[PDB]
Amino acid sequence: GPSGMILKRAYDVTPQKISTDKVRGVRKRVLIGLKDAPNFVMRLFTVEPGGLIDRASHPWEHEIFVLKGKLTVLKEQGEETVEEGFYIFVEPNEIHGFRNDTDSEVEFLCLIPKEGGE
Amino acid sequence: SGMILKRAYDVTPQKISTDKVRGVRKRVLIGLKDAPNFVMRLFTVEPGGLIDRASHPWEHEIFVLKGKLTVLKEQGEETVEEGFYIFVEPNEIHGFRNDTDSEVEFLCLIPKEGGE
Ligand SMILES: [Cu+2]
Ligand SMILES: [Cu+2]
């Protein structure tokens, strides 16, 4: 493929609104997307206060790193909150979701294999 | 289980000190034991630390978490700060240095073919 390196301020990517049956109060920046990625993509999610990524599962994993705030993680059984500096691994097909129960924006990096989209 | 939630700091850093890498610690957050496709590491570069120029047949996806990171390119260099992401194409010459007086941290993901 192509050569070179991209170095860019993540906030120079505009946050795009995500609105689906199971997602509300969320915006996403695609940092390293399908157009460039050999294998996996990098997104930066912003969860607004009260925003919800409701429980779901899908045939690919997540690798997540929490950048800002207190994130509530929804599990098959119950929930647990983590904060900036936590990582999360979600195996393929594992039930998961996220909620922001705080009054300030939560941000996390979320990487998936590119077969799962961007 | 099917979900791991952990404070990255709690993962034991590994000291690296070789002919090409000095003053660097590496945490493997999501490693080969868990990862179906790609691995997640967190590097700490001490003041004056160096990851010297190299290339390899896999990409890097990096996010700068803390500090001012000097990025070595095939020729020359570029400094970036916390809040920058870096995509290094496969085979591109790259490395890293910390010219500041405090620790620099960055997240670094590679496909599993690259090891952890
Ligand atoms: Cu998901
Ligand atoms: Cu490298």
Side-chain angles (χ1 to χ4, degrees), chain A residues 1-15 17-23 25-69 71-76 78-118, chain B residues 1-18 21-32 34-67 69-80 82-116:
Chain A
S3 60
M5 64 176 81
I6 293 170
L7 310 86
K8 186 173 186 167
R9 176 175 174 259
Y11 280 163
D12 287 5
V13 182
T14 297
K17 184 178 241 178
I18 304 306
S19 194
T20 64
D21 289 334
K22 280 189 182 172
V23 179
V26 174
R27 310 182 93 86
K28 180 181 76 174
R29 293 173 167 97
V30 177
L31 304 190
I32 308 171
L34 294 170
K35 70 183 187 181
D36 294 328
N39 290 298
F40 60 92
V41 295
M42 181 187 280
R43 301 92 54 81
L44 194 163
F45 283 84
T46 304
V47 189
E48 309 300 349
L52 175 63
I53 301 168
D54 210 356
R55 283 182 178 84
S57 65
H58 38 66
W60 59 86
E61 69 277 17
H62 290 292
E63 304 195 12
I64 287 164
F65 190 95
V66 185
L67 295 172
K68 180 178 169 185
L71 185 65
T72 301
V73 182
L74 310 181
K75 304 182 293 182
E76 181 160 0
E79 61 191 45
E80 176 182 358
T81 48
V82 301
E83 65 189 358
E84 167 184 4
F86 274 66
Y87 69 92
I88 304 170
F89 175 65
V90 189
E91 80 179 36
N93 309 304
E94 186 63 31
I95 291 158
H96 62 287
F98 310 99
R99 205 173 57 231
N100 184 358
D101 296 332
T102 77
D103 65 11
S104 52
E105 289 182 337
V106 170
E107 300 176 349
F108 61 92
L109 289 171
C110 189
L111 301 100
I112 60 174
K114 69 179 189 167
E115 65 199 60
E118 69 182 17
Chain B
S1 69
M3 187 185 300
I4 298 165
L5 302 85
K6 186 172 172 178
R7 185 188 302 277
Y9 168 88
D10 288 346
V11 175
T12 307
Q14 308 171 38
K15 294 191 280 172
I16 317 297
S17 177
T18 71
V21 175
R22 297 178 286 290
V24 172
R25 297 149 73 88
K26 174 177 93 164
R27 288 174 167 89
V28 177
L29 308 185
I30 308 169
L32 293 174
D34 290 306
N37 289 297
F38 58 90
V39 294
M40 183 190 281
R41 305 97 60 75
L42 194 161
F43 283 87
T44 305
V45 191
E46 296 155 13
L50 175 65
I51 302 163
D52 212 349
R53 287 183 171 84
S55 62
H56 37 68
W58 53 86
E59 70 277 18
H60 283 290
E61 304 197 7
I62 286 160
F63 194 95
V64 184
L65 294 170
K66 176 183 174 175
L69 182 60
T70 302
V71 182
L72 310 178
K73 300 180 164 193
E74 178 175 15
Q75 178 177 18
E77 62 186 41
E78 177 174 344
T79 298
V80 304
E82 161 178 13
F84 270 62
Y85 74 92
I86 305 171
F87 172 50
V88 184
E89 292 279 15
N91 295 87
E92 188 65 31
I93 292 161
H94 63 284
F96 306 99
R97 195 172 73 239
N98 180 2
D99 284 352
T100 78
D101 298 329
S102 49
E103 293 187 336
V104 168
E105 293 177 1
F106 62 89
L107 208 66
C108 191
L109 301 99
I110 58 172
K112 67 185 182 25
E113 63 195 80
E116 44 175 54

